[PDB]
Design a protein around this ligand. Structure first.
Ligand SMILES: *[C@@H]1O[C@H](CO)[C@@H](O)[C@H](O)[C@H]1NC(C)=O
Ligand SMILES: *[C@@H]1O[C@H](CO)[C@@H](O)[C@H](O)[C@H]1NC(C)=O
Length: 291
């Protein structure tokens, strides 16, 4: 159980020389050095922070000075990453999703009215501030009136913009976000009453670069005059590095056309990610749900 996942990574030579289970996954205080500031200042996108203010980043990363912000789990782990695809519509995969002890959800995590299909347990919620607010606008009349909240549930920020860093800073302090495109929003309205550093985590920009370099490097790279993996792909791979067993639900498959776009109703490579989950499923590393 507790190591029957990494064994399948060893039995296959393709992913053995691809999985680096030592590069950090989460960014926090004891990693923000002048050296890291010089490197990531040469990269835009969530791969770095070119053109981003040192005052904005040094103030939000210093709030993550706790030793608990380095890891995702407590000091066997079966995880379930639930994508918002339409294949879960009527699948009634509720009992299987909630059977896991850690459930990963992202973006429009519509639960009400679809609990029998996608379950009700939520342990992590990865998102960008852009896609989180966009889903709260378009999917409000479909159930998604708020992001999933819980007692020991933790949120994962994707550092794709200063809106993500400013939101992360205001979420821990409790003060409403005082600047940027999101000026005026109450962090407690999204995430809840508790405002501690143990509640909010940040994905490492070097971890996203490592994923886009080893696992999902497409031909859609127009940097001459950006491209990042989907949030669900970021969550599936983050759980692939931090869990002892992962099951993917509602992710892009070959027979995507048979179902709606979501089970309740932007430069990425859907076909590459879909093929990634296929080859990762043949190797015994991923329990990809299909039908
Ligand atoms: C994996 O990454 C870590 C840190 O970046 C490095 O120390 C290690 O050598 C890498 N592994 C391989 C096989 O390159
Ligand atoms: C798909 O989702 C819709 C919206 O909830 C629902 O009415 C329908 O029964 C589901 N299944 C099919 C096969 O359309």
């Amino acid at each position: 159980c507790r190591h029957l996942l990494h064994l399948a990574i060893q039995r296959h030579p393709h992913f053995r020389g691809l999985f680096n289970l030592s590069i950090p996954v989460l960014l926090w205080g004891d990693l923000f050095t002048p050296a890291l500031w010089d490197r990531l200042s040469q990269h835009k996108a969530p791969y770095g922070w070119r053109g981003l203010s040192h005052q904005v980043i040094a103030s939000t990363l210093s709030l993550l000075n706790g030793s608990e912000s380095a890891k995702l789990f407590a000091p066997c782990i079966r995880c379930a990453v639930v994508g918002n695809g339409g294949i879960l519509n009527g699948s009634r995969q509720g009992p299987n999703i909630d059977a896991h002890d850690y459930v990963f959800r992202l973006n429009g995590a519509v639960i009400k009215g679809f609990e029998r299909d996608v379950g009700t347990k939520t342990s992590f919620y990865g998102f960008t501030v852009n896609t989180m607010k966009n889903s709260l606008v378009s999917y409000w009349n479909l159930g998604f009136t708020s992001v999933p909240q819980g007692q020991d549930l933790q949120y994962i920020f994707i550092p794709s913009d200063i809106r993500d860093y400013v939101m992360l800073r205001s979420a821990i302090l409790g003060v409403p976000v005082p600047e940027g495109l999101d000026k005026g929003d109450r962090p407690h309205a999204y995430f809840g009453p508790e405002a501690s550093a143990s509640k909010f985590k940040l994905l490492h920009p070097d971890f996203i670069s490592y994923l886009t370099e080893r696992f999902l490097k497409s031909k859609l790279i127009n940097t001459h005059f950006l491209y990042m993996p989907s949030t669900g792909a970021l969550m599936l791979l983050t759980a692939l590095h931090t869990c002892d067993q992962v099951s993917a639900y509602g992710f892009i498959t070959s027979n995507y056309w048979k179902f709606s776009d979501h089970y309740f109703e932007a430069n990425h490579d859907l076909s590459l990610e879909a093929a990634l989950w296929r080859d990762l499923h043949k190797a015994g590393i991923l329990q990809l749900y299909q039908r």
